[PDB]
Amino acid sequence: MLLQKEREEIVAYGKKMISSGLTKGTGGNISIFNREQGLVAISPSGLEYYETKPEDVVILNLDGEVIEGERKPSSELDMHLIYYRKREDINALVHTHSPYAKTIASLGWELPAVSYLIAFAGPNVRCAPYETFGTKQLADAAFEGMIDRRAVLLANHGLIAGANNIKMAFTVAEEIEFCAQIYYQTKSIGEPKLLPEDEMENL
Amino acid sequence: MLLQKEREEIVAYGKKMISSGLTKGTGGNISIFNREQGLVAISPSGLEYYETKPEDVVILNLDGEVIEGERKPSSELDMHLIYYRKREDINALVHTHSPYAKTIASLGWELPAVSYLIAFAGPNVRCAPYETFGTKQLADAAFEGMIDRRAVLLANHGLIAGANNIKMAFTVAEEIEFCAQIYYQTKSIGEPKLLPEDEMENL
Amino acid sequence: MLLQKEREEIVAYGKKMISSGLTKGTGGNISIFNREQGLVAISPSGLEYYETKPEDVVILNLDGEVIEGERKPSSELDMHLIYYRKREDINALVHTHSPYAKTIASLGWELPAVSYLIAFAGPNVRCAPYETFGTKQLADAAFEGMIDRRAVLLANHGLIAGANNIKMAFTVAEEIEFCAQIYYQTKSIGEPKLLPEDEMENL
Amino acid sequence: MLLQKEREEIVAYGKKMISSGLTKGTGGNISIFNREQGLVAISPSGLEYYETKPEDVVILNLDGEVIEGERKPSSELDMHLIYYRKREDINALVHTHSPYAKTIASLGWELPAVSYLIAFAGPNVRCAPYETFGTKQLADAAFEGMIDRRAVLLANHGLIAGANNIKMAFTVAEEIEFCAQIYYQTKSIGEPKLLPEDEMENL
Ligand SMILES: [Mn+2]
Ligand SMILES: [Mn+2]
Ligand SMILES: [Mn+2]
Ligand SMILES: [Mn+2]
């Protein structure tokens, strides 16, 4: 099989996603880019994470064509491909439907520097405006909201995080979900203290 | 045994319900309709989900008479039967006592389009007014609140979701509970952005 | 050993308590009364629930004297014994340090009829005023707050629930914790609808 | 190996930390001081807790020099060493990135006597002002905020707890996180009742 290592990683981290509470059901999706070949491994659409085998992962080229795999690729594949076409610093993406990030996103709010952990994404995390699930418009909105960042909130939908490898992409998704929990909880009872921009640069 | 497949599914999804945090104790209940025979399989009353065997599931006809099974059928069976009598698009029901749906229900509020996932149920989810547990009045209220929808909130009680099969009925219950969590959390700190009606139709 | 059945049940339900999120650490405690003998089995003080064996459970008489067992009985034993002396309808007690009940208790608030599940305890659940941990004063406060009820909130501390057997006592503790979660969450965003007194009698 | 017992305990309690929800990812860190030798065992930097073996734990002297171990010691090691240099009552430290403590910390608030469990730390828990992750400035801030206490909140970061042994240090971290949950939840809907200073002394 093509991209064997990547396929195994997508299976492993999909299990980690549902187990960490970062998604519900079969929703959410993960991809890993093999930069040497120009090929993308992506989670299959609508399969349970603990029922997914490496052979179920789908291999795409950057035009969205299936190169290998019998399963349907994630319905959100356009939102993954755009990062591998239009940046060179992202080789893996974790897209979650996680509750605290989705909460901040569904208010249309940015996530400010409520924690030093925000630095996993940047000085803040922007909120991309709503676009329809599974469309190129949403792919554009996600990418544009994530410029010079490693994560972006998706209004009324969730979060996507990217990094140089899958371990770091997952770390960014999990730590930014945690930051969103802190922002939601502090805003529930008061006004959080925020870190200054130069400290966020320092970090 | 009658409805063997359905019995096995009710056992499996009952375990999924308690494990997903969608109910407490022995509360909540699941049914599956065999349309070909006019028979309903339903979870037994007051049994622990991880102690339930396929033989413990009870088979009813549409008049509420026990056709097969030694256990007492769910005390909420009237609220299940009404859907199999008065609609033709529902073949399975998942009734939960889940916290975020019950929260919105106990305010007497509808659940509006805070997420694209609301479309699993419809353009919104209504709240049926309170009626006493285990009665035909509650069955009527649930059904009437769920007209042209796949889920309804039950004031001071919980949620019921229905669909063409048990996998989809469970999916609707879990995703609408998640939507209720987002609505509760956003309303705690601000005013959520809602999706327009034509987008909900689009979805 | 004396009260073998009761000892095994205390071990089993202690595990259920920590696993259900109804307590933290070694805190909380469970007792079961053998009415025929006038003997009380109670969880040992400061032992981890998954490290507790039936022989670790302590047997007391109604004067608080150790009849059998090498372990120290729960430091909260006075709050258990009073129910077995001064009522005849309670044969088991589950005392939790659970977050939503403790939240309502730490405001000094009663828990009103926000759910039909409140009927597991009565028409409402009172809040006993604060008294020092491990004292007879707290035992008196708990008992007095629980008159004609199967549960009571303990200000800045937790909850105790009692019933005719251990399965029902645990059920009351878990369902009243759930009701407290609904009350906390509804009060966070609005004013919950409450069930009328005659309906609570009906239930 | 040096400090074998301590190494095994750090592995065990690191697993307990992630499993109790007291940290995310590889963040957080635990140390145990061998007072007889003047040596500190500390969790390694960036290793998954369930992938950590006793040999992965790092042994330091009080000058921060590695005495034994091939792994990099925790990046937060300065915040541990200061307690073993400047107090004599602390022999173990549990540093968490737990959500409710971090919430109160990120508002810059003290945690007052909302529960008798606050007495595990003292009459209250102070909030140390923000200092950069992994620095001696943060070590100083933590220590100074924890004077005459067994825990301190770290603004926009988390919590550290210390005690005479690792079991008690973990207990303090877990129970103070729980107290922070109660404070956050009560403040969300009202004004909590607080215990008086003389009662906190009594406790
Ligand atoms: Mn998505
Ligand atoms: Mn029900
Ligand atoms: Mn207690
Ligand atoms: Mn830290």
Numbering used by the authors:
A (entry chain A), B (entry chain A), C (entry chain A), D (entry chain A): 1 to 203
What does the primary publication say about this deposited structure?
Here we demonstrate a dAdo disposal and salvage pathway leading via 5-deoxyribose, dR1P, and dRu1P to the mainstream metabolites acetaldehyde and DHAP. The three enzymes, acting together in the presence of ATP, were necessary and sufficient to generate DHAP from 5-deoxyribose, as shown by using a coupled assay to measure DHAP formation. DrdA is a unique member of the class II aldolase family of enzymes, differing from most others in both the nature of the metal (Mn2+) and the aldehyde co-substrate. Although, like similar aldolases, DrdA is promiscuous with respect to the aldehyde co-substrate, it is unusual in preferring acetaldehyde.
Structures of fuculose-1-phosphate aldolase (FucA) determined from several sources including S. pneumoniae and E. coli exhibit a fold common to the class II aldolase family composed of a five-stranded antiparallel β-sheet core surrounded by eight α-helices of varying length. The metal coordination around Mn2+ is close to ideal tetrahedral in the apo-structure and is a distorted trigonal bipyramid in the complexed structure. The addition of Mn2+ to demetallated DrdA resulted in higher aldolase activity than addition of Co2+, Mg2+, Ni2+, or Zn2+; the apparent Kmetal value for Mn2+ was 0.95 ± 0.31 µM (mean and s.d. of three determinations).
